[model samples]
Target: DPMVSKGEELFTGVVPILVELDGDVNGHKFSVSGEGEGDATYGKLTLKFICTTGKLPVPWPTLVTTFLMCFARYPDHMKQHDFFKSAMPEGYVQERTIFFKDDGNYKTRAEVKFEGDTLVNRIELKGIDFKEDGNILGHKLEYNYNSHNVYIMADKQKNGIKVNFKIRHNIEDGSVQLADHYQQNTPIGDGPVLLPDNHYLSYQSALSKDPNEKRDHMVLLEFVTAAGIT
Candidate 1:
């Protein structure tokens, strides 16, 4: 029931504003202010999912902390996410960017940006600043932001929301759209939050019984601009 309602919450809302434009995407920046600057039709963005492990539970912050610890991964296999739902209202002829917050010992953030000529996404992590490497279950893990050409897609039926994405398998190949990777996030929490904060660190055990638990949770997201889609 909780999950269902959450889906309803996510399924029905439009874009909110908690914005910015940064990263390599900046390379194609401003571009002399639209001066003969090619296509006014700046196009759209790519989608990708970022996975970071650190869950299974320890002391606190479970979902994200526990969620963070027990897991660690990302990729094109994103298309495989048990699609809870799909794309959104009308034609998603738009682009978007979203960066929010959460903090503690371990954390993460998901975002989008309509920088340069196209739109894009990223998932950053911060917490115990560890060395970047691959994992056991199979995830070319990077402690920083795991970025790639990806998008949110799906339908309104059995699917709640589909996080369809592709992995270059490699970093960049110049074949399709290239995801601009960012090494900005360290340890603690990335761009935004899950469910936002240093405001993180909430111990699941600290509050036993659902009724006894009541902490603020946040999800910072932005809908595309023409304005929405996968």
Candidate 2:
């Protein structure tokens, strides 16, 4: 219920905040200033934030930390046991890491700072894609995922800006995965599969707040994906 409340708050506000608890993307600035004031004779509106970036001085931990600890200890546990690294496709290097941007789901429990105009921040997430050396020795399947964060400079004089996104995927099996996370806001789907580079999934966000407001903003992310039998 608290998450639902946060969603509602994000829906309508002078400024918007999005946080990723898993990664080190903690310090960031959120503002809406000097935006959409006016253009020339045509009279246009601009958008912007008193934007800045900084370290999120507080610790926002996620299960990723715990997993890393376990992974570090695995070798010690298997010290006396035999092991075999997996093989992979010739052109492939092991997926040694996972990346996380913005899960674009639940509200993170990180502290957000607000200045009169400028802001700063940081955070980190575990892998969205599982790192793989291509060994099928354990023959277990794994998958990786991605995350995203956006910075918006909306028009301060005209209509505000609002964004809603959805994703749809047609898999090899001809199954369709839709991004209808209105309720759960989880991910599209998960699993191990080869993906095309620059795989552009379609997304649409309606600008209901500002009909004439064009979204001019920057986005940064922590891309965390991993691979292995686990």
Candidate 3:
């Protein structure tokens, strides 16, 4: 019942926003944006499910903190994150970056840029700081911010709202910091939190009831009853 109602609250916030967009199959849409790669040594990440009625004068402090937490081990990742997210209205579009370690730590910055109604994605990978080989890798997907199909329909049906996303998988090079390859598993495995930080402590014990709790809790995610990517 609690999850259902929380889902409802999320729906209320989300549905209204999409409706504001007029469910226009044209003009503008939503998309996914995240950074990470897929592999045992590295990690995978997908970020979506956002609904807010108000826009902050600057980047939301919570969002900033959320990204910061993920890049804790690599200060360089932190550096690029700060440089990028604030570089422009980076949050406006959905994108992803990956941290890979082939022999050393390799982090790539991939971004989906939405301009007016056009979508463009760019990826710059294999940097000198994180990668020992001093190689620069880059790639970009044929940009598609198909806003019309952005929201999860089933999510709307179950939670009564619209949800968008950004997903990616990362692989680490198994460097000194990640000698055991454990950090790559947690954040990359599961999804986001169950409740926003406001209700964090309240559900801490309940969420952590399982002894095998490794990933971060999926807070503010109740709005998304369900989701998927092809």
Candidate 4:
């Protein structure tokens, strides 16, 4: 939990304020903004993404496949490992920028602005398209002043993907719970549990035997400095 018992105080103070994914995938440099500071003071979550991978072939996947076979009969097909390794052009390309804001009553919405390339190509990718913004309209978020618990539900449909996320921390018991459920367009592949519309995955960590055991652990910090506070 955001709150801590006296003994486990040292192991539970730090939490993730911001998480970013910087990577190039399928000849597209994606700057993904994950979670950000979770508090009222930060009214809007500002996220900017620019594709760094430059002009790619019209049918990039087919081009990549042909190029791979030319070098060797057996070639790695992993998009990042193959395409980004040899095909991704150097220099920054542009994608879309997104912003998420809370309206009221635990409701959140998003705004999306497309970059030139995406607009020209008429790109429509699930999770990356503006259609996902509509899902945010029905999204709900709940949290406490002390930050002990957080729940987010993306209840609308767009390209057949839905998200349910929750986090609960209890300092008194030195317990932590993290759960995630996603409804993907495809069936369960490897480890994910199959649901009617999608799949489910979850993880949890805590002091199982004794909450005081948490006192011996050290928490990791995602943000070390806080600004505009006295």
lDDT of 3 by residue, 3-89 (tens): 323212221211111101111011112222223211111111222222232221111111211221111111221222111122222
Q: What is the per-residue lDDT of model 2 for residues 1-230, given as tens digits with 9 covering 90 to 100?
A: 33223212221223322322333222222222222221111112122322233332111111211110001111212211101001000111111121222222223222222223211122323222222221111112112222322111222222221123333322234543332221111111131112211111111111112345344222221222222213
Clashes of 1: 50
Which of 1 and 3 is ahead in lDDT? Answer: 1
> Candidate 4 lDDT, tens digit per residue, 62-149?
1100010001111112111111112111111112222222211111122111122111111222222222222222222121111211
How far is 40's C-alpha from truth in model 3 (Å)? 28
In TM-score terms, candidate 3 sits at: 0.19
Task: List TM-score per model, in order.
Answer: 0.19, 0.19, 0.19, 0.18
- Model 1, TM vs. native: 0.19
lDDT of candidate 2 at residue 200, scale 0 to 100 = 15
Model 2 Cα shift for residue 63 (angstroms): 17
Estimate every model's Cα lDDT from 0 to 1. 0.21, 0.21, 0.20, 0.20
Query: Model 2 off-target regions past 4 Å?
Result: 1-109, 119-121, 128-230
* Total clashing pairs for each candidate: 50, 70, 36, 2
Off by over 4 Å in 4: 1-157, 173-196, 205-230
